[PDB]
Structure formats: C-alpha cells, structure tokens
Amino acid sequence: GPVPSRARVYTDVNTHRPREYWDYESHVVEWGNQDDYQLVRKLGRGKYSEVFEAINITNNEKVVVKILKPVKKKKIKREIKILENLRGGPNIITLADIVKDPVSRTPALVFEHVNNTDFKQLYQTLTDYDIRFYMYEILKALDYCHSMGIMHRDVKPHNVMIDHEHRKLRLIDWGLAEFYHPGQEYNVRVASRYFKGPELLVDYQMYDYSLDMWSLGCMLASMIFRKEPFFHGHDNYDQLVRIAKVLGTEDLYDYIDKYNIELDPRFNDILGRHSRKRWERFVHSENQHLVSPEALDFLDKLLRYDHQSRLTAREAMEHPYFYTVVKD
Ligand SMILES: [O]C1=C(N([O])=O)[C]=C(/[C]=C2\SC3=C([C]=C(S(=O)(=O)[C]C4=C(Cl)[C]=[C][C]=C4Cl)[C]=[C]3)[N]C2=O)[C]=[C]1
C-alpha cells in the first residue's frame, strides 16, 4: 500500500492543544441578534453558501453575510471553529458574528467587509512590486493558519480579497479548511481544478499544509506569466497531464514511486513522456517585466510534485524574491 507522510513543520500542533480546540463536532455556537443585520444585495452563490453585502445597524457599517446551505452538516461547525481559532491572525478574514437566518433556518456568518477588485481586472494591473507585496501578505495568512494546525485547502484568486486602494488583503472562504493531524487521511476532492496539488490528482490522501503551497505557486505562475490559469486542464485527469507537460513525467514517476502510489490506469493512454521544461520558456515581451531570476527560483521551489520538498510558508517568506518588499 502507499507509504505514509507527515508535515515537515507544525506536525504536532493539534496534539498539544486542548481537545476542544480541534474537536469541532462538540463546539457550541453562541448566537448573536439576526436583527442587527440587514441584507443589501447578493454578491455570490456557490455550492455551499450565498454571500450578501449587508449593513450592521448597530454601527451602520457594511458587513458580509454568508448564509450556509445545509450540505455536509459537519462543515458548518468545522468552518465556525476554524474562524474562531484563527480570528485576529494576520490577513485572516474576521468573523464578527453568527446569527440564525430566519428564512434558511441555517447559520449566517457575519464577516468584516473587504472592498475587492475582480481578480480578472486586478491581476492585469499588478506591477512586479505589487505581486511580491501581495504574495508576502498571503504568506503571512498561510504561515499563521498552518502554525495553528489548519490547512486552507482552497487557495485560489477568488478566495483572496484585495482592497488595492488601501493595500489590504484577506484570505476568505474557510469552508474547506481542516485540522491537520499526522497520519490522518483526507478527502482529495478539495481545491478548485486549476489549483489542485499533484497529491490530490494522484489520490494520495495523507497530505498536509504543503497542499496550500502548490495552490499558491499556481497563483504566482498565473500572475508573473500573465496566464490565467497557468495549468489549464479540461478535467482532473488532463490537469495532471498539463502539469507533467511542464514538470516532466520522470519526476512524476519518481514522486508516485516514493510514496508507493499507483497512477489510475486511465493515464496509460494520455500521460505520454515529457521533459521538465525551463521556466524561461513562459517568458515573453508582455510578461518579462514581472519575471526575474528570483521570481523563477521562488516559483520553482513551490511547484514541486513531492509535497515534502515544497517551501513551507515561513521558508517562502525568507526567499530573496521578497527582499525588495518594504517590511511593515
Ligand atoms: O467565507 C467568506 C466569503 N465567502 O465565502 O465567499 C466571503 C467573505 C467576504 C467578501 S466576499 C465579496 C466582497 C466584495 C465583492 S465585490 O467588491 O463586489 C467584487 C466583485 C463585484 Cl462588485 C462584482 C463581481 C465580482 C466581485 Cl469579486 C465580492 C465578494 N468582499 C468581501 O469582503 C468573507 C468570508
């Protein structure tokens, strides 16, 4: 069977916290007053929630209200407990309240509101400096949640709110986030297609925080190369082929062989044989101002098949790529 794996950092954070910290099933929700919040307009609907702009009438301030759908019930307390655990962390969205929506009869989560620009608009605007600045800000959030024994598992542009005017960033949508327990086997059906790590795509369940670092690397590549998304698979199978067309098939086989994983036989006809490509291949006159030797080295160290070989968040923050970013 598959060889086991453990995170190289924050391995035992949850085992040394009190049980109530991670045992979310036993958590008891304390409700606020639903009449404090008036819905103003629908912002979005996903598989698991509807999100609204609202006004808190106790201060007349804009808030965000996320009305949870009754999908997987366990997700509800999991998300709530994770948000409370992380509240106050750097660039973590602040859960301000929890109310019972009278129409859905489900929890509505009340968040601080962030003024955002659609990433499709904004990423076309970012300078080299802006990219490094915001990547560093995301790393603060990820090192924080990893240090607190939590993996996000849905890092993607849509889950990073940026108020560009005030240079403010928040990591949102913790509905897929999970507590890391060494040796635990997790659902591989997480993350959005273009940001799924190789571990998910080869059905290796004993993954960790390093999943978020693959996802971040996918974001970085799309930004510095101006290619949205970078790995553009038409399904979860073709997603791995697209990655292997860049990182090569020999290192993919080395990866699955290390963990004694067997690829789905489905890949036999479609994977082919691919050399590892040099990152310089994706540089052209329209993105070269976003690329530097430092950017390419940093990206190279995030996008590794072996989840154990990727930079950790903290190591990433030490990288030369960030030397030019003014520290606050
Ligand atoms: O778990 C969450 C979630 N979530 O689940 O989506 C959202 C949030 C907060 C959000 S969502 C949210 C906005 C702002 C906008 S926006 O300013 O309206 C940006 C736009 C607009 Cl005008 C139109 C189309 C797309 C977007 Cl992104 C959209 C969505 N800002 C927020 O602070 C917190 C926690």
Side-chain angles (χ1 to χ4, degrees), residues 41-44 46 49-53 63-68 79 83 93-95 109-119 152 157-162 170-175:
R41 53 175 184 171
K42 192 145 72 152
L43 293 175
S49 60
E50 291 212 308
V51 180
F52 299 79
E53 179 191 305
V63 294
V64 170
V65 176
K66 180 176 175 174
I67 297 171
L68 305 187
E79 187 172 355
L83 287 166
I93 197 75
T94 294
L95 180 68
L109 312 182
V110 189
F111 298 95
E112 71 177 309
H113 171 279
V114 178
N115 278 326
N116 178 57
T117 300
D118 160 52
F119 79 95
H152 186 274
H158 272 135
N159 287 339
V160 179
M161 296 294 105
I162 302 165
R170 296 291 183 272
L171 185 47
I172 62 157
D173 205 346
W174 296 78

Coordinates of all heavy atoms in Angstrom, one line a residue, residues 41-44 46 49-53 63-68 79 83 93-95 109-119 152 157-162 170-175, ligand 1:
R41 N -27.5 43.4 -0.8 CA -27.5 42.8 -2.1 C -26.7 41.5 -2.1 O -25.7 41.4 -1.4 CB -27.0 43.7 -3.2 CG -25.6 44.4 -2.9 CD -25.1 45.2 -4.1 NE -23.8 45.7 -3.8 CZ -23.0 46.3 -4.8 NH1 -23.5 46.5 -6.0 NH2 -21.8 46.8 -4.5
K42 N -27.1 40.6 -3.0 CA -26.4 39.3 -3.2 C -25.1 39.6 -3.9 O -25.1 40.3 -4.9 CB -27.4 38.4 -4.0 CG -26.9 36.9 -4.0 CD -28.0 35.9 -3.9 CE -28.8 35.8 -5.2 NZ -29.4 34.5 -5.4
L43 N -24.0 39.0 -3.4 CA -22.7 39.1 -4.0 C -22.4 37.9 -4.8 O -21.7 38.0 -5.8 CB -21.7 39.4 -2.9 CG -21.8 40.8 -2.3 CD1 -20.8 40.9 -1.1 CD2 -21.7 41.9 -3.2
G44 N -22.8 36.7 -4.3 CA -22.4 35.5 -5.0 C -23.1 34.3 -4.3 O -23.6 34.3 -3.2
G46 N -22.4 29.9 -4.2 CA -21.6 28.8 -4.5 C -22.4 27.5 -4.2 O -23.6 27.5 -3.9
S49 N -23.0 28.0 -0.1 CA -23.4 29.2 0.6 C -23.9 30.3 -0.4 O -23.6 30.2 -1.6 CB -22.3 29.7 1.5 OG -21.2 30.0 0.7
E50 N -24.6 31.3 0.1 CA -24.9 32.5 -0.5 C -24.3 33.6 0.3 O -24.3 33.6 1.5 CB -26.4 32.7 -0.7 CG -27.1 31.8 -1.6 CD -28.3 32.4 -2.3 OE1 -29.2 32.9 -1.6 OE2 -28.3 32.3 -3.6
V51 N -23.7 34.6 -0.4 CA -23.0 35.7 0.3 C -23.6 37.0 -0.1 O -23.9 37.2 -1.3 CB -21.5 35.6 -0.2 CG1 -20.7 36.7 0.5 CG2 -20.9 34.3 0.1
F52 N -23.9 37.8 0.9 CA -24.5 39.1 0.7 C -23.7 40.2 1.3 O -23.0 40.0 2.3 CB -25.9 39.1 1.4 CG -26.8 38.0 0.9 CD1 -26.7 36.7 1.3 CD2 -27.9 38.4 0.1 CE1 -27.6 35.7 0.8 CE2 -28.8 37.4 -0.4 CZ -28.6 36.1 0.0
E53 N -23.8 41.4 0.7 CA -23.5 42.6 1.4 C -24.6 43.0 2.3 O -25.8 42.9 1.9 CB -23.1 43.7 0.3 CG -22.8 45.0 1.0 CD -22.7 46.1 -0.1 OE1 -22.0 46.0 -1.1 OE2 -23.5 47.1 0.1
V63 N -21.1 45.0 6.2 CA -20.6 43.7 6.6 C -20.9 42.7 5.5 O -21.6 43.1 4.5 CB -21.2 43.2 7.9 CG1 -20.7 44.1 9.1 CG2 -22.7 43.1 7.9
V64 N -20.3 41.5 5.6 CA -20.6 40.5 4.7 C -21.3 39.4 5.4 O -20.9 39.0 6.5 CB -19.4 39.9 4.0 CG1 -19.7 38.7 3.2 CG2 -18.7 41.0 3.1
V65 N -22.4 38.9 4.9 CA -23.2 37.8 5.5 C -23.2 36.6 4.6 O -23.6 36.7 3.4 CB -24.7 38.2 5.7 CG1 -25.5 37.1 6.3 CG2 -24.7 39.5 6.6
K66 N -22.7 35.5 5.1 CA -22.6 34.2 4.4 C -23.6 33.2 4.9 O -23.5 32.8 6.0 CB -21.2 33.7 4.5 CG -20.9 32.4 3.8 CD -19.4 32.1 3.9 CE -19.0 30.7 3.4 NZ -17.5 30.6 3.5
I67 N -24.7 33.0 4.1 CA -25.7 32.1 4.6 C -25.4 30.7 4.2 O -25.4 30.4 3.0 CB -27.1 32.6 4.1 CG1 -27.4 33.9 4.7 CG2 -28.2 31.5 4.5 CD1 -28.7 34.6 4.2
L68 N -25.1 29.8 5.1 CA -24.6 28.5 4.9 C -25.8 27.6 4.4 O -26.8 27.7 5.0 CB -23.9 27.8 6.1 CG -22.8 28.7 6.7 CD1 -22.1 27.9 7.8 CD2 -21.8 29.1 5.7
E79 N -16.1 25.0 9.9 CA -15.8 26.4 9.5 C -15.8 27.4 10.6 O -15.0 28.2 10.8 CB -16.7 26.8 8.3 CG -16.3 28.1 7.7 CD -17.1 28.6 6.5 OE1 -17.9 27.8 5.9 OE2 -16.8 29.7 6.0
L83 N -12.6 29.6 12.1 CA -12.7 31.0 12.0 C -12.4 31.6 13.4 O -11.8 32.7 13.5 CB -14.0 31.5 11.4 CG -14.2 31.3 9.9 CD1 -15.6 31.4 9.5 CD2 -13.3 32.2 9.2
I93 N -9.6 36.8 7.4 CA -10.9 37.4 7.5 C -11.5 37.3 8.9 O -11.3 36.2 9.5 CB -11.9 36.8 6.4 CG1 -13.1 37.8 6.2 CG2 -12.3 35.4 6.8 CD1 -12.8 39.0 5.4
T94 N -12.1 38.3 9.4 CA -12.6 38.4 10.8 C -14.1 38.0 10.8 O -14.9 38.7 10.2 CB -12.4 39.7 11.4 OG1 -11.1 40.0 11.6 CG2 -13.1 39.9 12.8
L95 N -14.4 36.9 11.4 CA -15.8 36.5 11.7 C -16.3 37.4 12.9 O -15.7 37.4 14.0 CB -15.9 35.1 12.1 CG -17.3 34.5 12.5 CD1 -18.1 34.5 11.3 CD2 -17.2 33.2 13.1
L109 N -23.0 33.5 8.8 CA -21.8 34.0 9.3 C -21.6 35.5 8.9 O -21.8 35.8 7.7 CB -20.6 33.2 8.9 CG -20.7 31.7 9.0 CD1 -19.4 31.0 8.5 CD2 -21.0 31.3 10.4
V110 N -21.3 36.3 9.8 CA -21.1 37.8 9.6 C -19.6 38.1 9.7 O -19.0 37.8 10.7 CB -21.9 38.6 10.6 CG1 -21.8 40.1 10.3 CG2 -23.3 38.1 10.8
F111 N -19.1 38.6 8.6 CA -17.7 39.0 8.4 C -17.5 40.5 8.3 O -18.4 41.2 7.8 CB -17.1 38.3 7.2 CG -17.1 36.8 7.2 CD1 -18.1 36.1 6.6 CD2 -16.1 36.1 7.9 CE1 -18.2 34.7 6.6 CE2 -16.2 34.7 7.9 CZ -17.2 34.0 7.3
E112 N -16.3 40.9 8.6 CA -15.8 42.2 8.2 C -15.9 42.2 6.7 O -15.8 41.2 6.0 CB -14.3 42.4 8.6 CG -13.4 41.5 7.8 CD -11.9 41.7 8.1 OE1 -11.4 42.8 8.1 OE2 -11.2 40.6 8.3
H113 N -16.1 43.4 6.2 CA -16.3 43.6 4.7 C -15.0 44.1 4.1 O -14.4 45.1 4.7 CB -17.5 44.5 4.5 CG -17.6 45.0 3.0 ND1 -16.8 46.0 2.5 CD2 -18.4 44.5 2.0 CE1 -17.2 46.1 1.2 NE2 -18.1 45.2 0.9
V114 N -14.6 43.5 3.0 CA -13.4 44.0 2.3 C -13.9 44.5 0.9 O -14.6 43.8 0.2 CB -12.3 42.9 2.2 CG1 -11.1 43.4 1.3 CG2 -11.9 42.4 3.5
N115 N -13.5 45.7 0.5 CA -13.6 46.2 -0.8 C -12.7 45.5 -1.7 O -11.5 45.5 -1.6 CB -13.2 47.7 -1.0 CG -14.3 48.6 -0.6 OD1 -15.5 48.4 -0.7 ND2 -13.9 49.8 0.0
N116 N -13.2 44.8 -2.7 CA -12.4 43.9 -3.6 C -12.5 44.4 -5.0 O -13.5 45.0 -5.4 CB -12.9 42.5 -3.5 CG -12.1 41.5 -4.4 OD1 -10.9 41.4 -4.3 ND2 -12.8 40.8 -5.2
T117 N -11.4 44.1 -5.8 CA -11.5 44.2 -7.3 C -11.4 42.8 -7.9 O -10.6 42.0 -7.5 CB -10.4 45.1 -7.8 OG1 -10.5 46.4 -7.2 CG2 -10.3 45.2 -9.3
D118 N -12.3 42.5 -8.8 CA -12.4 41.3 -9.5 C -10.9 40.9 -9.9 O -10.2 41.7 -10.5 CB -13.4 41.3 -10.7 CG -13.2 40.3 -11.8 OD1 -13.1 39.1 -11.5 OD2 -13.2 40.8 -13.0
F119 N -10.5 39.7 -9.6 CA -9.1 39.3 -9.9 C -8.8 39.4 -11.4 O -7.6 39.7 -11.7 CB -8.8 38.0 -9.2 CG -9.2 36.8 -10.0 CD1 -8.4 36.1 -10.9 CD2 -10.5 36.3 -9.9 CE1 -8.8 35.0 -11.6 CE2 -10.9 35.2 -10.6 CZ -10.1 34.5 -11.5
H152 N -5.8 25.3 4.6 CA -6.9 26.1 4.0 C -7.6 25.2 2.9 O -8.9 25.0 2.9 CB -6.4 27.4 3.3 CG -7.6 28.2 2.8 ND1 -8.1 28.1 1.5 CD2 -8.2 29.3 3.3 CE1 -9.0 28.9 1.3 NE2 -9.1 29.7 2.4
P157 N -7.4 32.6 -6.5 CA -7.6 34.1 -6.5 C -9.0 34.6 -6.0 O -9.0 35.6 -5.4 CB -7.5 34.3 -8.0 CG -6.5 33.3 -8.5 CD -6.9 32.1 -7.8
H158 N -10.0 33.8 -6.3 CA -11.4 34.1 -5.8 C -11.4 34.2 -4.3 O -12.3 34.8 -3.7 CB -12.4 33.1 -6.3 CG -13.0 33.5 -7.6 ND1 -13.1 32.6 -8.6 CD2 -13.4 34.7 -8.1 CE1 -13.7 33.1 -9.7 NE2 -13.9 34.4 -9.4
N159 N -10.5 33.5 -3.6 CA -10.6 33.5 -2.1 C -9.5 34.4 -1.5 O -9.3 34.3 -0.3 CB -10.4 32.0 -1.6 CG -11.6 31.2 -1.9 OD1 -12.7 31.7 -2.1 ND2 -11.5 29.9 -1.9
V160 N -9.0 35.3 -2.3 CA -8.1 36.4 -1.8 C -8.8 37.7 -2.1 O -8.8 38.1 -3.3 CB -6.7 36.3 -2.3 CG1 -5.8 37.4 -1.8 CG2 -6.1 34.9 -2.0
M161 N -9.4 38.3 -1.1 CA -9.9 39.7 -1.2 C -8.8 40.7 -1.1 O -8.0 40.7 -0.2 CB -11.0 40.0 -0.2 CG -12.2 39.1 -0.3 SD -13.2 39.3 -1.8 CE -12.8 37.9 -2.8
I162 N -8.7 41.6 -2.1 CA -7.7 42.7 -2.1 C -8.4 44.0 -2.3 O -9.0 44.2 -3.4 CB -6.6 42.5 -3.1 CG1 -5.8 41.2 -2.9 CG2 -5.6 43.6 -3.1 CD1 -5.0 40.7 -4.1
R170 N -7.2 39.9 2.5 CA -7.8 39.0 3.4 C -8.0 37.6 2.7 O -8.5 37.6 1.6 CB -9.1 39.5 3.9 CG -9.0 40.7 4.8 CD -8.3 40.5 6.1 NE -8.3 41.7 6.9 CZ -7.4 42.7 6.9 NH1 -6.3 42.6 6.1 NH2 -7.5 43.7 7.7
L171 N -7.6 36.5 3.4 CA -7.9 35.2 2.9 C -9.3 34.8 3.4 O -9.5 34.8 4.6 CB -6.8 34.3 3.5 CG -6.8 32.8 3.0 CD1 -7.0 32.6 1.5 CD2 -5.5 32.1 3.5
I172 N -10.2 34.4 2.5 CA -11.5 34.1 2.8 C -11.9 32.7 2.5 O -11.0 31.9 2.1 CB -12.5 35.1 2.1 CG1 -12.4 35.0 0.6 CG2 -12.2 36.5 2.6 CD1 -13.6 35.5 -0.1
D173 N -13.2 32.3 2.7 CA -13.8 31.1 2.4 C -13.0 29.9 3.0 O -12.4 29.1 2.3 CB -14.1 30.8 0.9 CG -15.3 29.8 0.8 OD1 -15.6 29.1 1.8 OD2 -15.8 29.8 -0.3
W174 N -13.2 29.7 4.3 CA -12.6 28.7 5.1 C -13.4 27.4 5.2 O -13.2 26.6 6.0 CB -12.2 29.2 6.5 CG -11.2 30.3 6.4 CD1 -11.4 31.6 6.1 CD2 -9.8 30.1 6.6 NE1 -10.2 32.3 6.0 CE2 -9.2 31.4 6.3 CE3 -8.9 29.1 6.9 CZ2 -7.8 31.6 6.3 CZ3 -7.6 29.3 6.9 CH2 -7.0 30.5 6.7
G175 N -14.4 27.3 4.3 CA -15.4 26.2 4.3 C -14.8 24.9 3.9 O -15.4 23.8 4.2
Ligands
LIG1 O1 -16.0 32.9 3.6 C1 -16.1 34.2 3.2 C2 -16.6 34.6 2.0 N1 -17.0 33.7 1.0 O2 -17.4 32.6 1.4 O3 -17.1 34.0 -0.1 C3 -16.6 35.9 1.6 C4 -16.1 36.9 2.5 C5 -16.1 38.4 2.2 C6 -16.3 39.1 1.0 S1 -17.0 38.4 -0.4 C7 -17.1 39.7 -1.6 C8 -16.7 41.0 -1.2 C9 -16.7 42.0 -2.2 C10 -17.0 41.7 -3.5 S2 -17.0 42.9 -4.7 O4 -16.4 44.1 -4.2 O5 -18.4 43.2 -5.0 C11 -16.2 42.3 -6.0 C12 -16.9 42.0 -7.1 C13 -18.0 42.7 -7.8 CL1 -18.6 44.3 -7.3 C14 -18.6 42.0 -8.9 C15 -18.2 40.8 -9.3 C16 -17.2 40.1 -8.6 C17 -16.6 40.7 -7.5 CL2 -15.2 39.9 -6.6 C18 -17.4 40.4 -3.9 C19 -17.5 39.4 -2.9 N2 -15.9 41.3 -0.2 C20 -15.9 40.5 0.9 O6 -15.3 41.0 1.9 C21 -15.7 36.5 3.8 C22 -15.7 35.2 4.1

